[PDB]
């Protein structure tokens, strides 16, 4: 219908409509029956459909169908055509708003826009830090008539949180058909983003009260106001959920009665190639601050990705609950290096390596419990930077007391341990008299 609106002189013809509908039906079958599974299972479903279907399908020998969208013209077009190698502004390096386009990113944004436009509740499932909130917000940027409200669920979450959100962002107005709950603003669809939907505790009889409340609000379009036992009908209110896989510790599988109204999309961790693309783009935007360091963007990104991968495999939730590593750590790595490089007019390669090592220590070593783990982190930081950055002064960039501070200077520069100790002694002398 939108295409026909864009072409008043030449509406869609029956043959083009038939082609487009066939291709979109296959695309929707793939993204509905395999949107909540891994890449391998999406490939398996695509192969099975290719074996059974009669519709025209892409002729690529190895690229699975899930990488092809359906153009309005009625032909398969690859998703890679919508993924350009962009150049991020140096002042927007690893900013929260910045999303580096990727195949998975654009596919998920298209799917979410398809689901969000229908005001259909949806749930994004995946490991923490995989990019569920990022993808949701990027897809919501394409829908100006939606205001998203963030809710964070915990094991102690009850429908009272949702009721407080409704009291803040909505109003109960009396209509002849009954009480209607609608957002205070007009023409905008409120989106309730619930970040930990499957954390709320199941009682001894296997139910989550807030999940039942949301299921009632979604299926029946409203809830009961317990103050006067009046049925309240929702208007212009939408629900979007996010959660870790139900097999994770502390997570409970959602009810099948709740899942039927809610399609689930699985957002897995970006692969090493996707990580390389995203954070190489971020480093290239970064290293334009110091032109002499521009040639080191690729080895720096390779070292970052390698150490992140090794730390992710080495430390898991089996050992400690807080041993969770995600692309969020890579984003903080990028932000820290950028903030350390911003005030510097010039810097040798060894200084960049020292900043990289300091940020790696501050991100991957501070949370470790045992001393052996910290020793492993130190040794492997040294080995990674030696492997990806040969022919550099090993001692000048890896003096083990790697300390950085802006207490002895206006900028964030390395600080000697003895000078820092003397300064802290004087500051403590002042601190005793003041506080």
């Amino acid at each position: 219908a939108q295409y026909n609106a864009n072409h008043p002189d030449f509406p869609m013809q029956i043959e083009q409509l038939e082609r487009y509908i066939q291709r979109y039906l296959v695309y929707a079958i793939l993204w509905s029956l395999s949107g909540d599974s891994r890449l391998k299972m999406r490939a398996e479903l695509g192969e099975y459909i290719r074996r059974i279907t009669t519709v025209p399908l892409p002729t690529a020998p190895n690229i699975p169908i899930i990488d092809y969208e359906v153009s309005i013209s009625g032909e398969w077009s690859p998703w890679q055509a919508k993924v350009p190698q962009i150049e991020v502004e140096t002042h927007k390096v690893a900013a929260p708003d910045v999303v580096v386009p990727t195949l998975d990113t654009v596919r998920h944004e298209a799917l979410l826009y398809t689901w969000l436009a229908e005001h259909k509740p949806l749930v994004l499932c995946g490991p923490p830090g995989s990019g569920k909130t990022m993808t949701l917000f990027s897809a919501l940027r394409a829908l100006p008539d939606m205001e998203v409200v963030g809710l964070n669920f915990s094991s102690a979450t009850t429908p009272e949180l949702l009721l407080k959100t409704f009291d803040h962002y909505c109003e109960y107005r009396r209509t002849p058909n009954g009480v209607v709950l609608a957002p205070v603003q007009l023409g905008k669809w409120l989106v309730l983003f619930c970040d930990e939907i499957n954390l709320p505790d199941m009682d001894k009889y296997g139910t989550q009260r807030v999940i039942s409340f949301i299921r009632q609000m979604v299926e029946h379009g409203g809830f009961y106001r317990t103050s006067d036992q009046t049925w309240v009908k929702l208007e212009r209110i939408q629900f979007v959920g996010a959660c870790n896989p139900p097999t994770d510790p502390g997570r409970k599988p959602l009810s099948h009665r709740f899942l039927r109204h809610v399609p689930v999309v699985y957002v897995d961790y970006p692969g090493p190639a996707s990580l390389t693309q995203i954070y190489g783009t971020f480093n290239r935007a970064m290293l334009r601050l110091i032109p002499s360091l521009r040639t080191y963007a690729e080895p720096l990104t390779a070292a970052m990705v390698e150490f992140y991968t090794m730390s992710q495999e080495r430390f898991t939730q089996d050992t400690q609950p807080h041993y969770i590593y995600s692309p969020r750590e890579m984003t903080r790595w990028v932000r820290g290096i950028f903030e350390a490089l911003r005030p510097l007019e010039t810097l040798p390669v060894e200084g960049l390596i020292r900043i990289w090592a300091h940020e790696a220590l501050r991100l991957f070593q501070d949370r470790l419990v045992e001393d052996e783990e910290r020793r492993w982190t130190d040794e492997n930081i040294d080995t990674v930077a030696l492997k990806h950055f040969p022919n550099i002064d090993r001692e000048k960039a890896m003096s083990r007391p790697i300390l950085y501070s802006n207490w002895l200077s206006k900028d964030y520069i390395p600080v000697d341990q003895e000078e820092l100790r003397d300064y802290v002694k004087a500051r403590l002398k002042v601190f005793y008299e003041e506080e």
């Binding site: 207490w407 002895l408 200077s409 206006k410 004087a426």
Partner: protein, 322 residues
């Protein structure tokens, strides 16, 4: 030695060391060629800066002396200390003629008004008080600061007093009617020191900041505020706007003041350096490795070419300007 262009030079003239505790503040005698330095050992030692010889110690304070000031004639010295008292000293006979109580906590600043008949002091009880010199009575109490007031300074004619506090703001008060003329809140940390602009710098400030000539002819009093965010800001009291921010210090700014000719800004900080600022171009000309520890205060002689800085290393240094 251009009579309004000298700046201090690296080779020190003298390094006077008789204090047993960090030197809090150093001031110049307006008339005599003598110098006064207050320290944390509850002593007020008096030095001569022409020949660098100790003269006499002014004792009587129980705890650390935090500030000292001279009246216009140089015949009275007002000192405040950590023992919640303000003492007035007859600088001819070097006896304490009056002790003033009334502050509820540490008194961290003191200033004699330009007329010489009143004493204004700031303390840790978040109040500023005015004391008659003749009777020693508390006559006014400027309340409104939310935290420890660190400094109080009257302007040239004594109609305005500025104050800085741990509440990260600078307040300009009206002496006659107690009202708060302005509240200068742009520092991101505690404001340590303040200083007023001499009339000899009004034209320089106006043409450096690009401020157009007002129809009155008075550009409006200008103020400075060194703070712990390592920056110095120049304010226009009349409008309340920050004319410029001076960046370049590596630590908390402890003292700031103008060159007597009103062409440069002299500041000291805890980065162990004394810096000369060319606020014409909003940049720092000269950096002096003044002391081997934190530099707490500085003073610039009105006529003679001398700069003095006290420090936490218990040393008072006199700098020849060339």
């Amino acid at each position: 030695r251009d009579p309004k262009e000298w700046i201090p030079r690296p080779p020190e003239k003298y390094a006077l060391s008789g204090h047993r505790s960090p030197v809090t503040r150093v001031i110049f005698h307006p008339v005599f060629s003598v110098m006064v330095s207050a320290s944390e050992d509850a002593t007020i030692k008096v030095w001569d800066y022409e020949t660098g010889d100790f003269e006499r110690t002014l004792k009587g304070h129980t705890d650390s002396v935090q500030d000292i000031s001279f009246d216009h004639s140089g015949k009275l010295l007002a000192s405040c200390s950590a023992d919640m008292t303000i003492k007035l000293w007859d600088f001819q006979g070097f006896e304490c003629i009056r002790t003033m109580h009334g502050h509820d906590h540490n008194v961290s600043s003191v200033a004699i008004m330009p007329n010489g008949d009143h004493i204004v002091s700031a303390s840790r009880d978040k109040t500023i008080k005015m004391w008659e010199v003749q009777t020693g009575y508390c006559v006014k109490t400027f309340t409104g600061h939310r935290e420890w007031v660190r400094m109080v300074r009257p302007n040239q004619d004594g109609t305005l007093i500025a104050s800085c506090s741990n509440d990260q703001t600078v307040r300009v008060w009206v002496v006659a009617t107690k009202e708060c003329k302005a509240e200068l809140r742009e520092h991101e940390h505690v404001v340590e020191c303040i200083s007023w602009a001499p009339e000899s710098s009004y034209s320089s400030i106006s043409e450096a900041t690009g401020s157009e000539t007002k129809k009155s002819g008075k550009p409006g009093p200008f103020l400075l505020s060194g703070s712990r965010d390592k920056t110095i800001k120049m304010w226009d009291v009349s409008t309340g706007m920050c004319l410029m921010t001076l960046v370049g210090h590596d630590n908390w700014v402890r003292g700031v003041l103008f060159h007597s000719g009103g062409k440069f800004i002299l500041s000291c900080a805890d980065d162990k350096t004394l810096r000369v600022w060319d606020y014409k171009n909003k940049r720092c000309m000269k950096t002096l490795n003044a002391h081997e520890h934190f530099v707490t205060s500085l003073d610039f002689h009105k006529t003679a070419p001398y700069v003095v800085t006290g420090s936490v290393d218990q040393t008072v240094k006199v700098w020849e300007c060339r």
